[PDB]
Design a protein around this nucleic acid. Structure first.
Ligand code: MG
Ligand code: MG
Ligand code: MG
Ligand code: MG
Ligand code: MG
Ligand code: MG
Ligand code: MG
Lengths: 115, 127, 99, 156, 100, 84
RNA sequence: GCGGUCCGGCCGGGAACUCAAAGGAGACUGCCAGUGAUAAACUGGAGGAAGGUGGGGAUGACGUCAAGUCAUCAUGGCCCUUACGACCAGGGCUACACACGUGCUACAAUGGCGCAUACAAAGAGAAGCGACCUCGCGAGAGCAAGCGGACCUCAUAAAGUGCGUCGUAGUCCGGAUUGGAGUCUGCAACUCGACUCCAUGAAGUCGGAAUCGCUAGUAAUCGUGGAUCAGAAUGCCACGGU
């Protein structure tokens, strides 16, 4: 049941199960299914190891899971140690792309801390 | 040769023509079943064809422009009604009592300054 | 060479006076004509805040209506075109003769 | 309401069967200005009952209506400073109105495969009178029995 | 408004008039065209070199009769309230109070 | 961001002063008001006294900062906190 | 309707019609009946497209609040007039332990997702709207037709309907936030613009006391346009669909 990704995708449909994998959204899931050549409209037969083998050596060309996570941490921390304004917002837990901070910034800041 | 009718429900106009026939109706060079997707939208057109017995003897060319789905259907209904008015003018006591000759003058209201939806006033706090 | 006269004016009374004074000049030079047609009058609505400092519900709506008329001349003549140039008309209507 | 009294509003009758009640039922079922889908589900619900019960589904919906139509109400009032739930007899134009409204939300809490299916089961189970509609109507009856103590309070 | 503000605006529109037809449009097109190379870089330097008041975006249309920056209308070239009062006196043709 | 066809951005006075300083060697901080200019690799290893509104803050040019703008490393606001 | 029909109002052709706008007629408790105090009115009816002010708009009496505006403007008095005037570059009006008000998007199955398929009204447009064709997943780029407009362009509408999957799961929900890469305006998008593609997927499973709008095409909901505008709407002003 485990796909080449670290997580184990469910076995309910094909596109939906692919969209359960980290690093691939709906559009990237469509790309990988087009690369493999598998569609849901085929007959019920030959649903076996005959397709996930191709899945393993195709997904390797993408950046997913730890590699993508390692890249994202490096990007924010490259921003961090640089002493940048964009990193300074990252340090202070404030909106980083220029959203207002006077109100309506709750999701990046966290819950409303009282006085 | 062809009896004429006009219909307008909300913002649409209907062009309705009568000839003798075998009870077939064409709408905008298209069958009514193909054109009006909604079942209620479909059979409101043929509603006056029951109390009037001429359903099986009239081929009916119609062209309707403007408005929306329910509006065009109501316009279609009013146009057939008037087209019948210049034919028999003797079924009034039944047709008026149903309510088909009546032109629906009800209409969408203009937006107002200081209103959001032309009647809805913005929600305010007393304080 | 059939020409097409376009007339614009703010006031509806003025366009009718204009389209009724051009036609008999056409008869004065003696050429058959065609009836003017009402092209859809255009209405422009400006909504302006009336208070000097502060309000929002107090606002007045001002509309400019421009009426547009078309004339078609079937068989022109040099005398007919001379009459169009020579004839005097109201300052509220502009001329857009087209060959 | 305060100066000029007016009567009821006339609603175009049901086109497929000629009833006024079916049109009103589907209208009150209509939500967010969507009558197109409302017409589709009401026709589907009645035809499922047509194949289940007798062919004339008119009577089946009628009986599922009568066993839940309420003849007594509960009205909150304050005369001398105390909450009075006065019971009053309701005129039939409001009787049938309140009955079908409750059925509407009864179906929503059923939670079946689809909205059409749950309405069909709700209208069928009301015909056998085992329905949650009858449950609600027995619920209003017990509180109505309870309100007979309030029945002789102020503004009877 | 202020005589200083009005004097500022007249100078701004004059320089834009002076420069819009001589360099501005051609520098914009030669930066957009993909046929040229690195002549666009040279062009960007000279574009910045100009007095920089020549941009029509540097202009703010104001009520010419009063200089009010806000509540301007393009068709009449006046402030909102100045249009209203002049309309009441009847100075704008074909203009009245709408109703529909 | 300025479109790739248009290239990056740089100011004439800044560009002329950067190349003179580079040619004459990194000697002194470069005084500037043009925060809108973009950090270009020609000024690597230099200290730029970028203006924030009241005081020209020095910044050192490093490889990882290239592409970001000159005025980016000059926070114009001083907010310690809403506490004491 | 006539014929022709590059079989598409496209061509002669017709002005009957939809429509465009110009004038005119009609809706007045006009007639009947009942109630009423034989009055006025109210109720019902007949006809009638519309019946009781037909539905909305403009129109706001005398006066109240030392209501707001000296920052549209004008103006009495007061003050500066090598400065409370004026020219510049950068910055700020966008800051954030928090509170309030007004809104937009949701928590979903009446929904989400994909395909096929049908109709609107109102407006804008000459330093402007910009087709078709080609490239680009894309916002856009290139070439460039036409349109001062009932012709040309923004321009096709969206919920709708028919199909199949989703199957009640913080989910093929929800979209914040964040990363990377980009497009367009403009001299320049760091503070501080909008939009596109890929990557992440936070709260939220309908909300306490309390509180607001709305009586008919009105609530509700779905899109569309305008002014402001180089660029910058969930605001404002308008339009139509159910
Ligand atoms: Mg609306
Ligand atoms: Mg002054
Ligand atoms: Mg500007
Ligand atoms: Mg005061
Ligand atoms: Mg004050
Ligand atoms: Mg502000
Ligand atoms: Mg704009």
């Amino acid at each position: 049941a485990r796909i080449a990704g670290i997580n184990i995708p469910d076995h309910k449909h094909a596109v939906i199960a692919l969209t359960s994998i980290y690093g691939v959204g709906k559009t990237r899931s469509k790309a990988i299914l087009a690369a493999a050549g598998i569609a849901e409209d085929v007959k019920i037969s030959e649903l076996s190891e005959g397709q996930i083998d191709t899945l393993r050596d195709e997904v390797a060309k993408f950046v997913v899971e730890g590699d993508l996570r390692r890249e994202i941490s490096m990007s924010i921390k490259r921003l961090m140690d640089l002493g940048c304004y964009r990193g300074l917002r990252h340090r202070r837990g404030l909106p980083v792309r220029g959203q207002r901070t006077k109100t309506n910034a709750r999701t990046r800041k966290g819950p409303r801390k009282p006085i | 040769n062809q009896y004429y009718g006009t219909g307008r429900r909300k913002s649409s106009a209907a062009r309705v023509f009568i000839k003798p026939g075998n009870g077939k109706i064409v709408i905008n060079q298209r069958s009514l079943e193909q054109y009006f997707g909604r079942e209620t939208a479909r059979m409101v057109v043929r509603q006056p064809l029951e109390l009037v017995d001429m359903v099986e003897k009239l081929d009916l060319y119609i062209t309707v422009k403007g408005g929306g789905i329910s509006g065009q259907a109501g316009a279609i209904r009013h146009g057939i009604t008037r087209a019948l008015m210049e034919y028999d003018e003797s079924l009034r006591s039944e047709l008026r009592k149903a309510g088909f000759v009546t032109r629906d003058a009800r209409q969408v209201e203009r937006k107002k300054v200081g209103l959001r939806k032309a009647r809805r006033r913005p929600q305010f706090s007393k304080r | 060479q059939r020409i097409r006269i376009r007339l614009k004016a703010f006031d509806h009374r003025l366009i009718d006076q204009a389209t009724a004074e051009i036609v008999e000049t056409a008869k004065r030079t003696g050429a058959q004509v065609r009836g003017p047609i009402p092209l859809p009058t255009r209405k422009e609505r400006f909504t302006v805040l009336i208070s000097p400092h502060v309000n929002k519900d107090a606002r007045d709506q001002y509309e400019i209506r421009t009426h547009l008329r078309l004339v078609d001349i079937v068989e022109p003549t040099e005398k007919t075109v001379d009459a169009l140039m020579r004839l005097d008309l109201a300052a509220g209507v502009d001329v857009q003769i087209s060959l | 309401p305060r100066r000029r009294v007016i009567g009821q509003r006339k609603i175009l009758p049901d086109p497929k069967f000629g009833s006024e009640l079916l049109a009103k039922f589907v209208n009150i079922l209509m939500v967010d200005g969507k009558k197109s889908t409302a017409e589709s589900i009401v026709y589907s619900a009645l035809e499922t009952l047509a194949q289940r019960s007798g062919k004339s589904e008119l009577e089946a919906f009628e009986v599922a209506l009568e066993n839940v139509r309420p003849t007594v109400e509960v009205k909150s009032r304050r005369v001398g400073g105390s909450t009075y739930q006065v019971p009053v007899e309701v005129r039939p134009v409001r009787r049938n109105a309140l009955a079908m409204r409750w059925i509407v939300e009864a179906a929503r809490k059923r939670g079946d495969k689809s909205m059409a299916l749950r309405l069909a089961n709700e209208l069928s189970d009301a015909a056998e009178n085992k329905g949650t509609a009858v449950k609600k109507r027995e619920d209003v009856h017990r509180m109505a029995e309870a309100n007979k103590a309030f029945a002789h309070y102020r503004w009877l | 408004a202020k005589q200083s503000m009005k004097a500022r605006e007249v100078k701004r529109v004059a320089l834009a008039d002076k420069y819009f037809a001589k360099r501005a449009e051609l520098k914009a097109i030669i930066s957009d065209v993909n046929a040229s190379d690195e002549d666009r870089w040279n062009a960007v330097l000279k574009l910045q070199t100009l007095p920089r008041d020549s941009s029509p975006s540097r202009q703010r249309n104001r009520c010419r009769q009063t200089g009010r920056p806000h509540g301007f209308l393009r068709k009449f070239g006046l402030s909102r309230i100045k249009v209203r009062e002049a309309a009441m006196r009847g100075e704008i043709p074909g203009l009245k109070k709408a109703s529909w | 961001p300025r479109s790739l066809k248009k290239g990056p951005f740089i100011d004439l006075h800044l560009l002329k002063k950067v190349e003179k300083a580079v040619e004459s060697g990194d000697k002194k901080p470069l005084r500037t008001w043009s925060r809108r200019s973009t950090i270009f690799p020609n000024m690597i290893g230099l200290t730029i006294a970028v203006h924030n509104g009241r005081q020209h803050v020095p910044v050192f040019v490093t490889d990882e900062m290239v592409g970001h703008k000159l005025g980016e490393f000059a926070p114009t606001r001083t907010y310690r906190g809403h506490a004491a």
